[PDB]
Amino acid sequence: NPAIKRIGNHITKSPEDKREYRGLELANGIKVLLISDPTTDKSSAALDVHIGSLSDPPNIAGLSHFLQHMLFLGTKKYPKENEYSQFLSEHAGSSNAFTSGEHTNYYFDVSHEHLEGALDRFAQFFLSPLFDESAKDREVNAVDSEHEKNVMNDAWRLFQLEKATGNPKHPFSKFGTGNKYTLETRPNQEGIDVRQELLKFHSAYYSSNLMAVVVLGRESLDDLTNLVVKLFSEVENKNVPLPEFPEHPFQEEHLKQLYKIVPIKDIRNLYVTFPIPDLQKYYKSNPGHYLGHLIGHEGPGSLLSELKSKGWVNTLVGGQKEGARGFMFFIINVDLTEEGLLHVEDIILHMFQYIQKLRAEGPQEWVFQELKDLNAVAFRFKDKERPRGYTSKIAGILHYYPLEEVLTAEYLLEEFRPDLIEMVLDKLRPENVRVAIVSKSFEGKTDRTEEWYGTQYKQEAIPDEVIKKWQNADLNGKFKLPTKNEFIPTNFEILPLEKEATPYPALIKDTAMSKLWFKQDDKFFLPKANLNFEFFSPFAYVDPLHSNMAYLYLELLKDSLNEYAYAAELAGLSYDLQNTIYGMYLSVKGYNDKQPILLKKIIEKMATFEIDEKRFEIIKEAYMRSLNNFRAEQPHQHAMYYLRLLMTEVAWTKDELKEALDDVTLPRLKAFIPQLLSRLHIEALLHGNITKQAALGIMQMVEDTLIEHAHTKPLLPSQLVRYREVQLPDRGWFVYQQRNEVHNNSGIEIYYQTDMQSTSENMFLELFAQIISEPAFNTLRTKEQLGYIVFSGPRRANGIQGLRFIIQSEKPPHYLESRVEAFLITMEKSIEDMTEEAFQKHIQALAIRRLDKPKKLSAESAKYWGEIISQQYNFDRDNTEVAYLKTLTKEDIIKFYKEMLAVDAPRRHKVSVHVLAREMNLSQAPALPQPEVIQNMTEFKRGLPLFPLVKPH
Amino acid sequence: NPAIKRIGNHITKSPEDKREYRGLELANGIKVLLISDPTTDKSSAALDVHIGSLSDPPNIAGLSHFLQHMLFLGTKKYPKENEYSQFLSEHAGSSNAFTSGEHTNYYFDVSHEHLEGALDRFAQFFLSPLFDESAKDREVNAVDSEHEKNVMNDAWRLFQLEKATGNPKHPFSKFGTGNKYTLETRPNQEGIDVRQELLKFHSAYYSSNLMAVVVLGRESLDDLTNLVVKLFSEVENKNVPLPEFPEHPFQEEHLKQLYKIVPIKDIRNLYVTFPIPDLQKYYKSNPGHYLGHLIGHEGPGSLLSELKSKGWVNTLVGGQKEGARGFMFFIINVDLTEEGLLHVEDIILHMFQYIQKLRAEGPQEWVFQELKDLNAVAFRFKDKERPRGYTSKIAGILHYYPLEEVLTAEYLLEEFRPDLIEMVLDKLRPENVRVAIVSKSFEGKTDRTEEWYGTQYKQEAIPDEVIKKWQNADLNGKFKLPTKNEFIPTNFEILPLEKEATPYPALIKDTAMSKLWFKQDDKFFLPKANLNFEFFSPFAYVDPLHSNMAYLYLELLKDSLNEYAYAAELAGLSYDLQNTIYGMYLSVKGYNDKQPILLKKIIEKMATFEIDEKRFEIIKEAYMRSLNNFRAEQPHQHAMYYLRLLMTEVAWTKDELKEALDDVTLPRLKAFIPQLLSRLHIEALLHGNITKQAALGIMQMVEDTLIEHAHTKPLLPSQLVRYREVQLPDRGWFVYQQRNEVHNNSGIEIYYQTDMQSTSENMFLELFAQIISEPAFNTLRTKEQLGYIVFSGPRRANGIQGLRFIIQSEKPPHYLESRVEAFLITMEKSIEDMTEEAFQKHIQALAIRRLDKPKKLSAESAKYWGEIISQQYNFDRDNTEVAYLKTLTKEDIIKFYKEMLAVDAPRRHKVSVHVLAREMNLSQAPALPQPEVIQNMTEFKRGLPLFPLVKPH
Ligand SMILES: [Zn+2]
Ligand SMILES: [Zn+2]
């Protein structure tokens, strides 16, 4: 075969991975991985191009990002603007893309029987895009919206600020995302045809070298091979030299700098950065990882431990940070306490003291050994990935590793390289450093402004005597290297499947204190378990005060055993502990071998907890800011939040919690804990590599610890209350209005309440949602360009359901309402006009979606956990509901729409949340009734019935 | 309701379709569609019975066909033989029926007011047919006559020859029409009684489970439902199983066969046939339509293109052909060049080469998607069909599609199935082929004759060595898939109706070169336009040589323009270009979006045309043949032809044209075109979704591009002569006599010239025509059985008019002549004794007929285009004429009759054309004068005056 330059030799894989693999290089230079999985419900492909933002013309910022958006909007072979989304939607598929500095990456998935149909329209993106003049004009608004979204985000401003602070001559300084000014306004002044610039960039850069493609489907490796050469062999090779950036954007005048930055949120952060060369070629030894593991450690003797005891820092992340081909960073970033802010200089000294300890001790082979062994274990027993993310990730890394190593490359490490470790370590020095402090105490004290986000900052040379001081950092005896990690699992035997083994979780314990659901794993066979525990107490949410305490208690508890839990987390054994509106949730995930030890330590510490006063005072302050910082979340997030508050029987607002926070007192918390724990009920799902007796033992141990240390007794059955959704009246419409003080966009959520969850009502909503799914996106975004964020879909809460719309835009909420209303009429009409096939396609699509099998334990566990926490206990819901769905008729969906959804529906139940921006041809919209505006959340709830609660099976 | 088994309310229809639909399944098994159109002037109904000639008793060919004729002739509820035809005639209605292999379809229309009366008389066809004994003896001759007109027609002989060459045991071999021998002579000899047989067949097969019914009217869906049930639920259900023909009439020994066949006309054709399975069940992917689209394609890279370039072929038809439940055909038919005839083996090689190309590429999804989307817009913007044809057609398809899917079913493709396409393509192989060659060069070299038509042929096995060469057909670089079609309409915006917009076309330009009529569509609102142009030049018809050249010129233009325009018409944009007696004629119709492009290209090529010598010689020999092939046209067609020749001032006969054809020469033609183009007037009608300024813009383009490329200057007003009619003398009778050399049947035209067209003279003539219409058919055909073809009505040429009778018959024309004379006398009494109420019935019937409103844009255009080409411009004609009609009395019509038409009218002007056959109680006929016998057409024209020409209203 002439279309193929070579066929790689094995692909090395996990011995647990039953998927089959072939690597290739096409004649035109495209690198390909083929994944055959005869099991898979969905198929996918990804194509990564080794070109991104850094290659934008200095002329037209964000052109690569704009091009990425445009490829979806039409091709020569498939010229319909939305041919691609629509095809995917009707065959159970999804798509997305992102562009970074050096890559632009495109992925989709689809029902396994439509790989080729999908792949054909996909390939066309890279052969002959239209860049339609009219689509270009509309879509420019979508990216402007991406950018608006981002302007008031601290992560994004910091991201761009770093760039605007190194060498301006350097591609690194570029604005990646782009906007209206950048992509339309500017280029129109200056007289640029942008459709031609899009066409030019595509031809210049979308070359077949520089491209890597990955395809996963049920077809054989041979069938997959033939499919790929036919579709991709005809992408033109233009031999484009791969861009390189040998010179660091941080030159000498950029080092030894201090930036003082004012954030949007009330946060207190310190960023420490060292320029380093590109360590990527050293992937087999990975010096940066070794140094990241150490600087980053959180166990006894670590940097964070001491910085925490001094009460300066709560949180630390350090390690290798990516740059581009030719440059990298090493970072040590930290959050700050009120004290910590006044001791930055000391903090950085402690940082250099730890680095000195590393130099003094020399590189440690046993540490490398441990890192290497963990990775080997992680690679073996790795969970099966969802096809979509898997093809996207492999497409990216196909540009860095030989075909044969793509799967292992960034897991397995082989070489101990003291010289490299020591070379990188030699760049982590006080000369050669950059410091950034993010605090609101810099309001008014700044002299500089960032062009693209508006970030306000000041810039100073770090005084030579300060550098000198850090250079003379001596050994601090509080800093020790970590100990042998004792949580490393050593037992991976999969216990045989029991005789009494069951396809779904079984109630194996039903006492007054405990309800234990159990299932031994019958499909994945990795040595892992998930242990889920819901703890009920009326005292966790009784009032705003108690809610606060429940939160602090668990934050304080997690903080206290962080040092101990860190070791376990590196050993692939983690936990999750958070308060809920019913009490607490605890989940332990990972290798089953040492789970009992971790769990026991957690429960022992729960029932025995001794609050340190200093930790209490610090965490309280952080929580105060956390509550305040909601003021700064996105308008669409506000809308969702207000609806939740508005539709739930009891729910405490953030202003309520905040007010109550001052009354939270150390004595009072010491009192709350034993009260919380005196009466509970525990419902649990134990699922994975465990036997019934092990499971029963685990439950009992949890119970027995709690009884022994906290004198826990059972809760009455009538105390196990669940909350209800408010019942909206036939033909009613309520509007709640609020202002977002930070963002210059509006948010809206529209909720059409339908009825209680039930097989029939579930599928009516679900199928209608499916039919309008891509049309909503296509109408409200692609055509009308209302905002970047446009969502429709089902809403499920408290056993009740409905249809929702969520939009964020610069257009007012009253206007958004009318456009969604206009859209609903267009939908009734198109359901009428569509053929019985079109209808039957959407049924089949919803079917494939609902019946998609879990690929990993956690995914299965989540399904079951959903059944348990909602008390519906419907483990076979998918077969039942899908069976019933195929029964449905184009006729059934129209009466449902007319009964519940249409503007003049007898049983329409509308509520809207309008969240105003911070300072406030197309189809025909219907006339709307005058809404009743909600003045007061409590009164609104008081004046309406509450729904029943859904019945168990 | 117990009379209705199932009721489905949805029929998926087009978004623009204003009519309303309800599907039904009756208790007796009848599938029903009702169409409610409150606006129609004509209601209609149809019934399709799923039984045809393929179910005829082996010993009585043509029974089903015969039975179809008989059902018109009387019923129990209505025993008067012509009650049905008369009723429809007196209420502006018309009826007809056809019999096919597995279908018998009956349909009528009538004044919307009289649906129930007509439907009732119609329902009876299916309850209590008389099958009158004496009616049966007469109507056999009608059938025999129908077969007789077919005997010498090449298409029918071929049709039956295919049947004669497959399995004789298969019901496919049956002769479907029947004749005197079949349905009378053989059965009497064999002892059969056919009335009994008609009755057995009717009762055995005319069962309700085998019937579909369609009713269209103004009445609501609910009234229509009651009406159909009242009249059709009483049809007995005999629970008849549907015939099934799973075995193919072509078996292994009927393949690899070659047939050499002698035509009647001088025609050279090649028929290639592949037997295939019934593909009907795959209607939603339509594999045969996909493969037909490609093999049948005419654009660059197609099979046709290569074949045409070798100078072997002119036209090509490809694709699937129906057979019956259980079997189908795939065909590739081509006409032949003198060279082509010598190169049949190579032509077929190329066919298989093209098929090979498709195998090697595999199913092309973009092609299918393109077809899908074209159908989607085709269906969206389809013209409103005439009720009669619409009911009939739908009645047919209700047998194949669920009630809800009928309107869309023959229109919308749904899923692309590459696997079926490959299943069908796999049948298109040399081992599976039949080949037929039709040419005069087999005259006297054949040894077989076909029973029913007498077709002369020879049959040979195709040598295995020839088969084996076709199997090895390799790839040919001349063949490619089509290009993406760039005529696909994109823009369907219906422009707002202008302030200065007129009900009728307005004269918006009046240059010495251009007279432009314009009207913006004010009633249909579809994104289409009709662009009509007449170009006047004296040089188009100055002499036979110049007629010939004008013809050849436009034929050659279209030939060269074909590759370009094929894609255009695939996309609902087409044109029509032909020489007229005056100058020439161009029409561009379809979606208006790309009309200017095509139109401009046509006028450009027109004015810039450079002839291909090979193309010239080929089209010339085809035109030579076509010219003398008129020898083989029907006697009644000869009749009409000579009348035209005799009655019009200047007219070239085909003998004159054929003779002058030899002097047409490449240089002479090259010289003719600029001479033709140099001086022109242009009259145009631009009607549709178009704007006054845009119309002006279109004319301008047309003129500009003529002026720029052909130096076209205006004609003089006195040059713009239209032709006049010969003026017959009072009491004169002339007979022109000729014989048909091919058909053993005679034809006749009788013309009673009255006077110049004028409101009164038009309405006298067309009211009399109305009154005598039905009686003429009943008397001369149904009663007297003179022949299958019996016609009467108005005749309009060159502004003059009169009454015509056309008859084709076994009888001599001198006899035919007295019988229409006899008829005219008994029409005199019939009107004399006609009741005053009956008279208004006819007046009302004419009224509704003339005042009936257009349903398509093109129907409206044609009505205006009529007024323009005839230079009358009476755009509100029907109102003024119908208003005058109502003034008319019995006395007035009688007065018009004895003065103009009666045997002894002082102003009777009679011409008779008698076409003799190849080899040549009752009301009494009147004594006739000796006619003057026309020896010479020129002598006759010269001895008579010429009428004036009509004044432009
Ligand atoms: Zn984006
Ligand atoms: Zn017939």
From Swiss-Prot, chains A, B:
**Motif span (SlyX motif)?**
810-815
Q: What is the effect of changing residue 724 to A?
A: Decreases dimerization. No effect on degradation of ANP. Retains the ability to degrade an aberrant form of ANP, when in the presence of both ANP and the aberrant ANP
- Offer a single GO CC term for the protein: cytosol
Description of post-translational modifications: The N-terminus is blocked.
Biological processes annotated in GO: amyloid-beta clearance; amyloid-beta clearance by cellular catabolic process; amyloid-beta metabolic process; antigen processing and presentation of endogenous peptide antigen via MHC class I; bradykinin catabolic process; hormone catabolic process; insulin catabolic process; insulin metabolic process
Q: How is the cofactor bound?
A: Binds 1 zinc ion per subunit.
Q: Which reaction does it catalyse?
A: Degradation of insulin, glucagon and other polypeptides. No action on proteins
**Listed result of changing residue 487 to A:** Strongly increased enzyme activity
State how changing residue 89 to C affects the protein, per the record: Increases catalytic rate towards INS and amyloid
Q: In which tissues is it expressed?
A: Detected in brain and in cerebrospinal fluid (at protein level).
Q: What class of enzyme is it?
A: hydrolase
What Enzyme Commission number does this protein have?
Answer: 3.4.24.56
Q: What is the effect of changing residue 141 to C?
A: Increases catalytic rate towards INS and amyloid
Q: Which GO terms describe its molecular function?
A: amyloid-beta binding; ATP binding; ATP hydrolysis activity; beta-endorphin binding; endopeptidase activity; identical protein binding; insulin binding; metalloendopeptidase activity
Compartmental location: Cytoplasm, Cytosol; Cell membrane; Secreted
Q: Which residues carry this modification: N6-succinyllysine?
A: 149, 654
Q: Which cofactor does it need?
A: Zn(2+)
Binding-site residues, ATP: 386, 852-858
The answer to whether keyword Transferase applies is no
Miscellaneous section: ATP-binding induces a conformation change.
Q: Which family does it belong to?
A: Belongs to the peptidase M16 family.
Domain comment (free text): The SlyX motif may be involved in the non-conventional secretion of the protein.
Subunit note: Homodimer. Can also form homotetramers. (Microbial infection) Interacts (via N-terminus) with varicella-zoster virus (VZV) envelope glycoprotein E (via N-terminus); the membrane-associated isoform may function as an entry receptor for this virus.
Q: What is this protein called?
A: Insulin-degrading enzyme
Task: Give the encoding gene's name.
Answer: IDE
